A and B are shown apart, each in its own frame.
Chain A
Amino acid sequence: LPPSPGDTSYYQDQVDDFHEARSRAALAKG
């Protein structure tokens, strides 16, 4: 079963998740 439509994993694979997690951490630090 697919996840909820509001979830970001609904439209993101593991490659996008790896890059987005790094970008989120760097921006949240600032």
Chain B
Amino acid sequence: GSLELCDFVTASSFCRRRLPTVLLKLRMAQHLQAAVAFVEQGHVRVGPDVVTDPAFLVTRSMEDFVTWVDSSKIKRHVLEYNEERDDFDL
């Protein structure tokens, strides 16, 4: 759009782009304190890299490539619930 929408940017817009709240949008977490907690142990990666800083704004392009890190206990539970655990892929 035009410059009209440019006057709506506030602290809320910046807070919505934080890494923990994106997990909360993506339904990877259901509570903010749980979403924050997942980050520092290192269960969450943005592409190849693992991000431990809760204060981290993720781009729209990078938002497509956020997922559980491999060899994480949470990813085991997701695969177990879906009956799709394959131990060859570790």
Which residues of A pack against B, CB within 8 Å? Answer: 1-3, 5, 10-13, 16
Contact = CB atoms under 8 A, between A and B. Distances in A.
Interface stretch (B10-18, B44-52, B80-88): B10-18
A10 B16 contact: yes
B23 to A, nearest CB: 9
Interface residues on B, range: under 10
A2 B25 contact: no
B55 interface: no
Interface string B54-85: 00000000000000000000000000000000
Interface in B24-46: 24-25, 32
Interface of B: 11-12, 15-16, 21-22, 24-25, 32
Contacts, number: 20
A11 B12 contact: no
A20 to B, nearest CB: 11
Contact of A1 (B12, B21, B22, B25): B12
Nearest to B31: A5
Contacts of B16: 10-11, 13
Contacts of A5: 32
